[PDB]
């Protein structure tokens, strides 16, 4: 988990970046995931939008599911509850280790809400050091 101040800082940047992405300003070549997402609010400037997009793509490409959830929340502006409702609606049957033995069952809505929150938190944790270093790298060289 990030500290409260680190979260406020990164969440702020991701809100600005998300609005910039949603306005269509990211070139398709810079991220196929973002481009595919966009085929289906104050904003940062273009230099910052590109820098953040390169950071996010370079971190989140490993987990397309989490990447999509990040884009739903920050770019489209969907609430965590709205993302979890759809996540729950399309969820696959899972092997659940219950008391007395395992069973096959689709996850509850409460479980899907917790998982969406955890996925967003884990994504911000991964993004934070890379974005912090990206801004510091730009400052150093320029």
Residue numbers in the entry: 7 to 46, 55 to 156
Task: Copy out sentences from the published article reporting this entry, exactly as the authors wrote them.
The Q protein of bacteriophage 21 (21Q) was characterized as sharing a conserved mechanism of action with Q proteins from other lambdoid phages.
The crystal structure of 21Q was determined at 1.45 Å resolution. A segment of L2 is disordered in the crystal structure, indicating the intrinsic flexibility of this region. Surprisingly, the structure of 21Q is reminiscent of the binary complex structure of σR4 bound to anti-σ RseA. Specifically, the folding of 21Q H3-H6 is similar to the folding of σR4, while 21Q H1 binds to 21Q H3-H6 in the same way as RseA binds to σR4. Because H3 and H4 of σR4 form a helix-turn-helix (HTH) motif and participate in the binding and recognition of the −35 element, the corresponding helices of 21Q (H5 and H6) probably participate in the binding and recognition of the QBE.
